[PDB]
Amino acid sequence: TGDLINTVRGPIPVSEAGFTLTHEHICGSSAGFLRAWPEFFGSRKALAEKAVRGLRHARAAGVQTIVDVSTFDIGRDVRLLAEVSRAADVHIVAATGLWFDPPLSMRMRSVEELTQFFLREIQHGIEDTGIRAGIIKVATTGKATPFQELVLKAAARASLATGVPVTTHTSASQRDGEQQAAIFESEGLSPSRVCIGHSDDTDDLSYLTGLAARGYLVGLDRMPYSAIGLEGDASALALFGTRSWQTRALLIKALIDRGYKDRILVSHDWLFGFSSYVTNIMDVMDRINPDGMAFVPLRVIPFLREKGVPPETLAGVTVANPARFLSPT
Ligand SMILES: CCOP(=O)(O)OCC
Ligand SMILES: [Co+2]
Ligand SMILES: [Fe+2]
Secondary structure (H helix, E strand, C coil), X not given: XXXXXXXXXXXXXXXXXXXXXXXXXXXXXXXXXXXXXXHHHCCHHHHHHHHHHHHHHHHHCXXXXXXXXXXXXXXXXXXXXXXXXXXXXXXXXXXXXXXXXXXXXXXXXXXXXXXXHHHHHHHHCCCCCCCCCCEEEEECXXXXXXXXHHHHHHHHHHHHHXXXXXXXXXXXXXXXXXHHHHHHHHCXXXXXXXXXXXXXXXXXXXXXXXXXXXXXXXXXXXXXXXXXXXXXXXHHHHHHCCCCHHHHHHHHHHHXXXXXXXXXXXXXXXXXXXXXXXXXXXXXXXXXXCCHHHHHHHHHHHHHHHCCCCHHHHHHHHHHHHHHHHXXX
16 A cells, blocks of 8 residues: 556556456557547547447456557557546556657657657656656567667666656567567666567567566467468468467466466457558457457456466456556566
8 A cells, every 4th residue: 555656537546457358458559649539540539439338348347557658659648648547547557658650759769768758748747748658668569670679778767767668569470579679678677677579479488488587577468369260361461370378367277277377467458549550450350359358357267267376366467466566666
């Protein structure tokens, strides 16, 4: 009791986050896009109503908090998050940092200047809203570009100044987490402040337990992603992959059986609109997983319990681990 985390409706006690999905999106977009072209999504209103329905579904399934890891360059719209959060009655933590689509006004910046940007969003507020970020989001897709190295150092420095954790996009098959960890540690950032994300996109347990052993959180955060049955759709296939959700969920069990229950975070990487990909991708997605952000509580948790993972363990994963991660430290 007494430890606080920032949400888009203001500060909440850590102990009130409850069942928390630590890597999700309301809308996967680009900076300025929802302002310039809202009809792409039907309308902003159609978008918000879809999002509220989704989050109410997740809520009815026991989800109390999502961490929306949309950065600036994912076109994060913190006013939109606040509105859907209020209407659905689900807590949303917003993000600072940069994903892998930074425009030139960011790409030209120094590590110092990025640190000041990330600190602004955490300590002052995003835009003119006063809504403060409660997590820093970074990305690589393979070996870090030169600019990506600065982003990761700036994320570490902002995290050390504020205690707010860092979470990452990886290309899991290329084992990005190992270079991310090296860079974070060169800045003196504690591995317990760091989640290495999209780690369920691989079945390489040597890679995963190696990170877990060093104290990193391992984000198994793309649960409902499977393109099985969708072989004739090259865009669906490249994005969702050819492994089933049961295969992804088996990784959670594998890490628990190897003693790493406290190093796991689970999520969907779901969204309610998606302009940064092919047109109509959202129809394909909703067909594959009509449960949205309830898929984890409805399908994954009972699959684990039936594999014999104890209720306490499953609570520790979905409640205690996010609370410990999000708590400024
Ligand atoms: C907004 C899209 O972000 P991502 O987590 O990189 O991938 C979503 C499939
Ligand atoms: Co990602
Ligand atoms: Fe994501």
